[PDB]
Amino acid sequence: TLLHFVASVFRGFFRIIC
Amino acid sequence: FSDAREKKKPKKDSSLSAVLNSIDVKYQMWKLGVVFTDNSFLYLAWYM
């Protein structure tokens, strides 16, 4: 679950930077 | 009701639904969010 949270944070960061 | 008379039904360890009601979705929300915000837990998760 922690890894899924980290992955979701990374995906959000990608969506915002792109 | 605090000042007034009260009747209470003690909880049962057998009943799982009682423990599920006792645990709070929003409190577990807040607690795990704080834990994830903690830096040392992040370092240990990196080690993971």
Side-chain angles (χ1 to χ4, degrees):
Chain A
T1 297
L2 181 145
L3 301 172
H4 311 133
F5 179 74
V6 175
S8 301
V9 162
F10 282 172
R11 296 292 186 270
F13 179 73
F14 306 149
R15 264 88 60 87
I16 307 155
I17 63 169
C18 65
Chain B
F1 184 69
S2 169
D3 291 331
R5 302 176 190 175
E6 62 185 1
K7 297 296 289 183
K8 296 295 182 184
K9 182 272 184 165
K11 209 177 312 189
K12 184 70 174 69
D13 195 1
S14 176
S15 179
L16 294 98
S17 296
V19 179
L20 299 175
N21 300 129
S22 77
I23 195 66
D24 177 28
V25 59
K26 302 306 154 168
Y27 187 66
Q28 279 322 115
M29 206 33 203
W30 172 81
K31 181 182 177 84
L32 275 72
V34 173
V35 168
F36 292 169
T37 315
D38 186 89
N39 307 339
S40 299
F41 197 60
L42 291 168
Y43 191 77
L44 285 191
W46 183 67
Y47 195 71
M48 254 328 78

